[PDB]
Amino acid sequence: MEEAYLALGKKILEEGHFKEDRTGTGTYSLFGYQMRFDLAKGFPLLTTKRVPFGLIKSELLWFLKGDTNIRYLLERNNHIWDEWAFERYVKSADYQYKEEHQKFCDAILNDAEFAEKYGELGNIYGAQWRHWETKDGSFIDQLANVIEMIKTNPDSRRLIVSAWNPEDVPSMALPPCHTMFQFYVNEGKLSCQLYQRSADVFLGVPFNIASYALLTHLIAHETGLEVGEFVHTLGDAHLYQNHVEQMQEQLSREVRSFPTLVLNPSVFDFDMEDIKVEGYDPHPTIKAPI
Amino acid sequence: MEEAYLALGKKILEEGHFKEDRTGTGTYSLFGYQMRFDLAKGFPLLTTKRVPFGLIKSELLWFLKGDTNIRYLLERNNHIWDEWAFERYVKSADYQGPDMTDFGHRVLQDPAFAEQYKEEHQKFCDAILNDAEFAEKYGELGNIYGAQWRHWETKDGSFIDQLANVIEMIKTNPDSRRLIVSAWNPEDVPSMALPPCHTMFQFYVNEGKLSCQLYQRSADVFLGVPFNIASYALLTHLIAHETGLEVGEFVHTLGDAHLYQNHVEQMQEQLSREVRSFPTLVLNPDKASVFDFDMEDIKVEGYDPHPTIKAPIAV
Numbered sequence: 001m002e003e004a005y006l007a008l009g010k011k012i013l014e015e016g017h018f019k020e021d022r023t024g025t026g027t028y029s030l031f032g033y034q035m036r037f038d039l040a041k042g043f044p045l046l047t048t049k050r051v052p053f054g055l056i057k058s059e060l061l062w063f064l065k066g067d068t069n070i071r072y073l074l075e076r077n078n079h080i081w082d083e084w085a086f087e088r089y090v091k092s093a094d095y096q097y098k099e100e101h102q103k104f105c106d107a108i109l110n111d112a113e114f115a116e117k118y119g120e121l122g123n124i125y126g127a128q129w130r131h132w133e134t135k136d137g138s139f140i141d142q143l144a145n146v147i148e149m150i151k152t153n154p155d156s157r158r159l160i161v162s163a164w165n166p167e168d169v170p171s172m173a174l175p176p177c178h179t180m181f182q183f184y185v186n187e188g189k190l191s192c193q194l195y196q197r198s199a200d201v202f203l204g205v206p207f208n209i210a211s212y213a214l215l216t217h218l219i220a221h222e223t224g225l226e227v228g229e230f231v232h233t234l235g236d237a238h239l240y241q242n243h244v245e246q247m248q249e250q251l252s253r254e255v256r257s258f259p260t261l262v263l264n265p266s267v268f269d270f271d272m273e274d275i276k277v278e279g280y281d282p283h284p285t286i287k288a289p290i
Numbered sequence: 291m292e293e294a295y296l297a298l299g300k301k302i303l304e305e306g307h308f309k310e311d312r313t314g315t316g317t318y319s320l321f322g323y324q325m326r327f328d329l330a331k332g333f334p335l336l337t338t339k340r341v342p343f344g345l346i347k348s349e350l351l352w353f354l355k356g357d358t359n360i361r362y363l364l365e366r367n368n369h370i371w372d373e374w375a376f377e378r379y380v381k382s383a384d385y386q387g388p389d390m391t392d393f394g395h396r397v398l399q400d401p402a403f404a405e406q407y408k409e410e411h412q413k414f415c416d417a418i419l420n421d422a423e424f425a426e427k428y429g430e431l432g433n434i435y436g437a438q439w440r441h442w443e444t445k446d447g448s449f450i451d452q453l454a455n456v457i458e459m460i461k462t463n464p465d466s467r468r469l470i471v472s473a474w475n476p477e478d479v480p481s482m483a484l485p486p487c488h489t490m491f492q493f494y495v496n497e498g499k500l501s502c503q504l505y506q507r508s509a510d511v512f513l514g515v516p517f518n519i520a521s522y523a524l525l526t527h528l529i530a531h532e533t534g535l536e537v538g539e540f541v542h543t544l545g546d547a548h549l550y551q552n553h554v555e556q557m558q559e560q561l562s563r564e565v566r567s568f569p570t571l572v573l574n575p576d577k578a579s580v581f582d583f584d585m586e587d588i589k590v591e592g593y594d595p596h597p598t599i600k601a602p603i604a605v
């Protein structure tokens with residue numbers, strides 16, 4: 001239910017606890033929240049504000065093939081992670097307007113070995129989902145494994161993917177906000193619950209819901225099953241103080257019907273062309289600082 | 291409140307579809323659930339049925355001290371992990387009693403077999419208790435809760451004390467959103483007697499109060515959940531004692547919440563009972579660290595529950 005997201009934003013406004021970090025960022029937060037999305041009722045892209053689907057699907061697609069290189073994202077006009085990769089280039093060896101960014105994006109896109117040394121991001125979801133390093137130097141492919149398990153043992157209560165490794169977290173720049181997820185099958189239907197330890201409630205959460213609903217759909221298709229529910233579980237849910245006006249504005253609009261997801265008749269061969277949304281009619285974009 | 295748990299059991303009875311589980315017992319099940327317990331309103335040891343706290347603290351201390359051998363538990367008359375150890379032993383090459391295949395179910399249907407099990411179990415326990423060679427090989431459940439909390443193994447030859455780190459993070463960085471301890475180590479799962487049912491937990495701080503949330507992938511609602519609730523409530527209190535905070539909420543999030551098909555009458559009888567006030571938890575003021583607490587240091591007072599409701603463990 002979209003109203004379940006709107007109730008959470010309202011509850012953060014009504015009773016969220018104010019905190020000022022060391023650096024002067026202010027949030028209102030709560031701890032312990034759950035919202036359900038029945039995927040048969042519609043694909044849960046928010047109608048109260050426009051949410052760009054392109055970037056969600058290229059990002060998910062990138063996670064799914066285990067890719068940790070940005071070339072794939074650049075090729076599809078996704079600039080999410082291309083800051084970190086650029087930063088890494090300007091404090092490196094081989095190096096008022098900054099049109100040097102342009103030459104960097106271009107070289108990554110048009111060079112053989114250049115994209116390997118400057119486009120690699122190492123340890124994030126794609127690598128944690130598809131390639132979890134063991135002590136003996138072997139690797140566990142958790143996603144593929146959970147897929148096989150769905151096919152051959154639907155009743156399993158162990159359909160689990162973890163993104164959280166206590167060895168790697170204190171040294172990585174962005175520890176995974178999406179901590180783990182669990183699949184579940186009953187009566188020909190696939191559901192997924194996701195534990196998110198930390199959530200940007202205005203800007204992050206709407207991205208997150210569509211991403212994991214899409215994931216559920218893709219695994220459903222792969223396993224020949226129908227879609228059940230997406231259960232989104234939160235830990236630290238926070239609304240940045242400069243997102244309040246934008247939230248209040250969102251609550252003043254009326255909910256429309258969720259649109260329809262359409263998938264081309266294995267999801268590891270899917271590109272952008274194979275995933276469409278039908279009947280998306282949201283209220284205009286609501287801008288906000290990051 | 292207890293009503294939160296009571297309501298969960300009712301909803302499974304009413305709406306939970308049937309599922310073929312790993313143990314072969316059969317379950318009714320829902321996916322996606324959350325319960326809140328305000329620890330300031332009392333210590334959530336269930337009143338609608340007697341719950342053995344002595345066993346809750348045993349199992350907790352055993353987790354905290356990093357131990358995954360059942361030996362420690364038997365010295366303290368706690369037998370709730372016996373079956374997984376015993377199973378491993380009766381599958382081994384060193385077992386020479388009568389056949390024990392699917393002993394979990396055959397004890398419920400066959401009184402002749404129920405006495406053979408009983409005696410093979412009595413001799414397993416004696417052997418674990420008095421024979422240290424046997425104990426070492428057959429008391430062992432693998433890298434479960436204790437080993438992941440205190441001794442999660444690194445690639446470069448060391449270990450992360452996951453629980454200790456997070457406690458000290460509460461003291462200096464109370465607003466952190468990374469106050470996480472995970473028991474799910476993909477490398478160790480297939481050598482675990484069971485992969486962790488209460489998989490992963492998180493902590494939060496506001497206004498001098500400490501709250502905890504648990505994600506429990508798989509939840510035995512009649513027999514296990516009341517243990518798990520009390521287990522994490524107690525843990526939250528220990529950490530609050532050490533770090534000098536009050537207690538906030540315990541939030542129980544569940545994946546597969548299930549009622550075992552042979553737990554239904556139990557849950558029914560339970561639901562027909564009037565809730566009584568929760569007891570109050572009492573900790574020894576002199577102790578400073580979580581890891582310094584022993585059995586006589588942790589007590590519960592004014593616990594006045596309805597009677598014990600017996601049920602069979604799914605093995």
Ligand SMILES: Nc1nc(=O)c2c([nH]1)N=C[C@H](CNc1ccc(C(=O)N[C@@H](CCC(=O)O)C(=O)O)cc1)N2CO
Pocket residue numbers: 341342369370371484487488509510513514515517599600601603604605
């Ligand atoms: N099927 C299953 N469910 C679980 O909840 C579970 C499991 N297996 N295997 C391991 C851990 C062990 N937990 C257990 C918790 C309680 C009892 C139990 O039978 N309690 C009884 C007996 C008390 C007594 O001995 O006096 C009770 O009446 O409460 C058993 C195992 N665990 C849960 O994490």
